Each structure stands twice: as C-alpha cells, then as structure tokens.
RNA sequence: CCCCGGGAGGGGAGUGAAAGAGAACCUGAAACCGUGGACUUACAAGCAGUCAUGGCACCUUAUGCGUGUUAUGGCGUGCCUA
RNA sequence: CAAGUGAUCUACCGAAGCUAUGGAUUCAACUCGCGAAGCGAGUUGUCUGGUAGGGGAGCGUUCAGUCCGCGGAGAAGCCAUA
C-alpha cells in the first residue's frame, strides 16, 4: 500500500514539551516561577516534622491460599 | 551584443579594466594614504605627478608609483592619449593587518596593529 | 465632493469607481441605489430630507482585498509580543445616479 | 482625501491696541497668526497672517497690573541674574510687552518660532509697511 | 543527529534588518538594536492606528467652526443647529469639504440658524 | 585602571564629525622659469638646481 | 613574451569551459573601512521611532501603485533581569 | 473690560467605554456528507487585557524510510525585491 499513506491513529502520538524556546509559550523560567527551584533536585516524601511519624504495630510473616470461588 | 546564457558570455567576453592599477598590500595605514590620495583625486595626471613630488608624506611615494601604472596601462595596454589623462577615480582600502603583541607596564601585553593598504587608482581621457 | 461617508454615501461625484466596506452584491449585480444627504448635481443642492427624495444608483465594479497590514502588539518588561496578519475586504462601486 | 491647500496668499492686517487689555489683544493676534480664522487646513503649514500692531505703547493693563506685572529674565550667569522689569517699564520698549504676550500664546516648536516672524509691533500710531496695505481688523467676535 | 543553527538565524535577522530601512545609525545595521527599536515601534504603530482618527476628527472640527465663524456662528452653535434640522447627519469630514465650497456651507449655516430661532 | 575614561563609544558620525579639519593642503606649485619643471616658491628648482643663476649640482 | 616599479603589486598576452579558477587560489554572509550617485542638512533641545501631510526622485512581485528620500505637524520614558 | 467665585440653564468638545459598517477567533444550540462519534463546515446568540501557570492548534532545522521529481541550457548556499 502507500507507505507514504500510512497514518498513525490520531491521538496516540503527542508532541513533547520543548521548554525553553521563546515567549510563544513557557518562556524565561521554564514553568518554574522564579524560585528555590533549581537544577539538582532533592526530595519526594519529606517535610521536617515528618508526620508519617505515627507509631507501628508489627508482624513479620504471612502465607496465603490461591482462591477458587 | 546579447548572449543566451552565462557560460558563453563568459567564454567570449573577457572584461577588462582600462586605466586601472592597484598597489596591493602596501605597509601603511589606509588613513594617511587616504590624505595623500584625496589631494590627488579628480586632477590632471601631470599635476598628480607634481603635487606628489612636493607633498611631504611618507605615503606620497607608493601613491606616486601606482599613479604611474595607471598612466602606463592607459598608454600601453589601453592605447589612450597621455596628454589627456586624468585621475577619474582613486581610493584606498584596507589590506590584512600585521598584529604584533608588545610588552607593557606591570606584566600586561598589548596588540599593535600594523595596517596595510590596497591603493588603487584609475585614469581616463578627461573629455567634457 | 462625493462622500463614502461612514458606510453609505451621499455626495455628488458623478461617474467614477470608489471603494466601500462590501456588499454581497455579486459581480456588477448590485446596482446599489443610494440615499443622498446632500449633493450638488446641478449647482443647486439641499439637505432637508429633500436629499432623501433624491437617490444615486451605482453599478458595482468588483470585490477586492485591501493592502496587507500586520497588527503588532507589545508591552514592556513582561515578554508579550504579538504579530498577526490582517487585511479587510471591500467592494468597488461605479457611480451613475441622479 | 481631506483637502490640503497650497498657499499663494499673503495676508497683511493692522490691529490697533489703544485701550485693549493686553491679554485680549494678544489672544486675537495669536489666533489670527496661527491660522484658526478661515478653515485652518493644514496645521503643518504657517498659513496664518502678518499682524501689524500699532499704538502698542497705549495698551491698557486693567487692575494693579501696571506695576504688579514683573516680567523676569535669566542671563546665563549664576551670579544672580533674574533681572525684572515692571511693565510700567514698558516705557523702555513697549513692543516687547506685546511681543511677549503673543509669543506665549503661540506654539513653542520649530514652526512656532518661525511664526514669531509674522508679528510686527510699533508703539506709535505709524508703521512703514504701507506697501502691503493691511486690512484693518476690529477686536472681538459676536456670539 | 546534530542540527546546528545553519540558515535559520541569519534569515530571521535579515528580516528584521530589512524592516530597518532608514533607521539612524546602528538602529538600522546592527540586529539587536534594530529588533529592540521595532519593539517600541510596535507600541507606536498600534496606538497611532487608533489615534489618527482622533486626529482627523480634530482637524475637521477646526475647519468647520472656522467656516461657522466666517458667518457669525461657531462649531457648538452650527453643529447643534444642523443637528436640530431634521438631523443632517453629514460627517464632520463632509462638512469640511463644504468649507471648500463656500456657497453651500453658507446655506447650511442659514439652515442651522433657522432650526434654532 | 585609568582615572578618566570615555563613557559611550563615539558614533561613526561624530567621529568623522571631528575629522572635517584634517584635509591636507596641496602645495602652491609653480613652473620653474628655466628647467621647465615644477618648484616650491622661495626655494631652489630641484630639477635644474637654478635660483636666478644656479647653485646646486645637477 | 611585453608594459610601470629596486621590489612588492599590478595591467596586457597566452593556457583553460571558466583567470567572474592565478597560487593571500571553491563559496565568500555580518560587523568594520572606503569610492561614486539620489534625496538632504549650518535658529537647532534629540530612546532617535510612529502616525499625517507637502516636496523631490525612480518605475523589472511596480503609475494609484507605490518605492527611496525629505520638510513640517502630532504623539512618544531603550532591552532584559529583579 | 473674569479667563476668579456661589447658585442656575443649556449647546458643544472629549476614551481603545457605547454605537455604525466590515471580518476573524472561543463556547453553545440548530442543518448537513457519513456507518461511528467527530471531522469539514453553514446560521444565530455569544466570547475574545493579562505576569507566574494549565490547555489547544501549528511554523521552521538536521537526519531516516517511501513517493514525486529537478539539475552543467546550471543544483545547494549567497544577494535584491513593492
Ligand atoms: Mg504550551
Ligand atoms: Mg531568574
Ligand atoms: Mg547541578
Ligand atoms: Mg579561448
Ligand atoms: Mg616584566
Ligand atoms: Mg516603556
Ligand atoms: Mg511588572
Ligand atoms: Mg473615538
Ligand atoms: Mg617582467
Ligand atoms: Mg610581477
Ligand atoms: Mg580577478
Ligand atoms: Mg572565484
Ligand atoms: Mg583574507
Ligand atoms: Mg598577490
Ligand atoms: Mg603574490
Ligand atoms: Mg570544485
Ligand atoms: Mg575564495
Ligand atoms: Mg566627488
Ligand atoms: Mg556618500
Ligand atoms: Mg534652517
Ligand atoms: Mg520627524
Ligand atoms: Mg468597544
Ligand atoms: Mg459587528
Ligand atoms: Mg458567528
Ligand atoms: Mg475585553
Ligand atoms: Mg487573552
Ligand atoms: Mg543556473
Ligand atoms: Mg546536504
């Protein structure tokens, strides 16, 4: 058939965010707002009072059956 | 004398430079050479050779020598009338530049620019 | 002294084309008839809706597009430049009317 | 498409000043010189008139103004310049008084300075511009 | 694959430099200063496209009451009296041109003076 | 650095502005009355060496 | 081979499709320097542009059409970052 | 000799607010080609200042596959252009 007339399903393919690159969209700061937002990123489940700091009740093992309703 | 495409107009029309001569790569700055040349300009070629005999710049020399090749080429290669020549155009342009680094106080250096000149001049049968 | 004034015009310049905002009147088909607020069609003239009792017909001449323009917007210090092409259509109408 | 006249016309005029309040005669002269009267046509062109003020010495200065009005001028020197004259010292040179008022009520640009050329003031009831036989004006308009 | 700037920058730059034309000094021959001049030129363009209409309104007004005062009226008075006379609705442009054809503007003045007595 | 220093680079226009004063003057040359060449006034005709009579060699 | 020159450099002649390739040897942008020409400027206050109109000049996407320049009027506080 | 000021009456000027004429965009509804939404639309109402930021459609450069082709009677690049 027409290898030139292969067409990807509309949708599916979508273009990448090219970030820097102009006051036509997402200019100077690259979607980042003028901040203490700077390259070498550091943290993901942390603030400093942590509060995932509730207490624990603990067993080690487990074992279980395959189910056949 | 119309032609049809470039290559033939190139192979049967060699395109000459009447009255023209250039002194390429003269080792002087174009500014001074221009002072002399500006006095020469639209002038009878005799007076050109005169004024140049009696004008005190170091650049009067090469500008005089080039003023001659014009004359020569006008009268030999181009068959003109020397009793009728004049400086239809003359100008100086910039050559390359001999950059020489030179020492200076307290460790730094510095770049002196010995400029060069392309002195061209071009003579013609001043009619009217 | 003929006057395309505003959108529908009313002034004595017998017999020449001139440009207007548009019509829909295809080709020469328009033959648009005109009001008249005052024109001197014979030295004499009037306004007091006696001009309205007169009218000037005009053949349509042709539709056209005006010269290209670029709308350009800018504001300091905030990025924000805007380039945008524009040109406005018109209808050219010949005049003949009373 | 608006009309833009060429201006072959030169228009001479003779305004008397005796008893007219200075600012008022001033405004009439400034208007007549700037254009205004007649359809102004182009602001671009100095198409106004030549005014020939006479009897400038006799200008009235209603109120205390005759000795209150202190024209002031500044020499470059930072020794105190700002010399000042009483306007009762229009006796020194009455035309200056008239010529000052008018230039105030004229544009300050290149063309305005060029306009000041069209004012001719003579403190007496006489003038030498007979060769242009100026038309007389009156002094004020009516509703 | 590499994809260096190549032809593209020079072409945008020449587009600005050609917009430059008779710009004084570096304003027309160095790119950056040409670009920046054209920013402020944008400002001036759009706003003047607005302003010119205030301008010609002003000029027609000047001429119209100049003619109105030629006959002992004035713009306020003549424009209102014309408005009172079965609304003439001539544009201020058009009333000027009749200040280039005096015999008519005269009758418009007499007509405005009527619908006003 | 260099106590006084210039503030903005000077314009291509103003720089040639100052220079309207460097044009050379051409000599007022004159025709020598014996050698039929050109000579500076109140000097000795270089071509023939003459000065009414003749002072210098060649 | 010839010409001007101590030379450097060049102008011819000749080879070659081409020297609009000549050994500072493919193209050869821009800054930057010059020559010539059009239009212009020595009473003038200026982010250098913008709108408007007159003058002058030219007509190869081009005679209502412009294009280049210019005089005068109005308007007008570079860019970016912060 | 108000162009000062208290009250009062009007006529005009005055903005990118309102309006006239033209046209485009956003969303909504109504109409259609289809076989499926939704695409291309056409009509009316409507919307359309914008910094960080979210969303949508796109322009251009190199390289690769496929197609279509151009090129010494001249490719690319460069330069001028209404
Ligand atoms: Mg986006
Ligand atoms: Mg930052
Ligand atoms: Mg890092
Ligand atoms: Mg051959
Ligand atoms: Mg040392
Ligand atoms: Mg600003
Ligand atoms: Mg801000
Ligand atoms: Mg408005
Ligand atoms: Mg030899
Ligand atoms: Mg040699
Ligand atoms: Mg060559
Ligand atoms: Mg080559
Ligand atoms: Mg080189
Ligand atoms: Mg060489
Ligand atoms: Mg060599
Ligand atoms: Mg090759
Ligand atoms: Mg090369
Ligand atoms: Mg010359
Ligand atoms: Mg020049
Ligand atoms: Mg002058
Ligand atoms: Mg200007
Ligand atoms: Mg609105
Ligand atoms: Mg509308
Ligand atoms: Mg709609
Ligand atoms: Mg809005
Ligand atoms: Mg918006
Ligand atoms: Mg070709
Ligand atoms: Mg390639």
Tab-separated table of N, CA, C and O (backbone and C1' of nucleotides) and ligand atoms in Angstrom, chain B residues 41, chain G residues 35-37, ligand 18:
chain	number	residue	atom	x	y	z
B	41	UNK	N	42.966	63.553	-6.260
B	41	UNK	CA	41.840	62.945	-6.984
B	41	UNK	C	41.550	63.512	-8.376
B	41	UNK	O	42.354	63.306	-9.295
G	35	U	P	35.872	58.047	0.792
G	35	U	O5'	35.424	57.794	-0.715
G	35	U	C5'	36.374	57.992	-1.741
G	35	U	C4'	36.024	57.257	-2.991
G	35	U	C3'	34.755	57.722	-3.664
G	35	U	O3'	34.951	58.866	-4.444
G	35	U	C1'	34.730	55.390	-3.510
G	36	G	P	34.133	60.184	-4.083
G	36	G	O5'	32.912	60.123	-5.081
G	36	G	C5'	33.159	59.950	-6.466
G	36	G	C4'	32.046	59.188	-7.145
G	36	G	C3'	30.630	59.672	-6.893
G	36	G	O3'	30.311	60.793	-7.692
G	36	G	C1'	30.696	57.346	-6.723
G	37	G	P	29.499	62.044	-7.088
G	37	G	O5'	27.990	61.660	-7.429
G	37	G	C5'	27.643	61.097	-8.688
G	37	G	C4'	26.338	60.344	-8.610
G	37	G	C3'	25.236	61.055	-7.859
G	37	G	O3'	24.522	61.929	-8.702
G	37	G	C1'	25.394	58.811	-7.143
I	18	LIG	MG1	33.125	63.912	-5.700
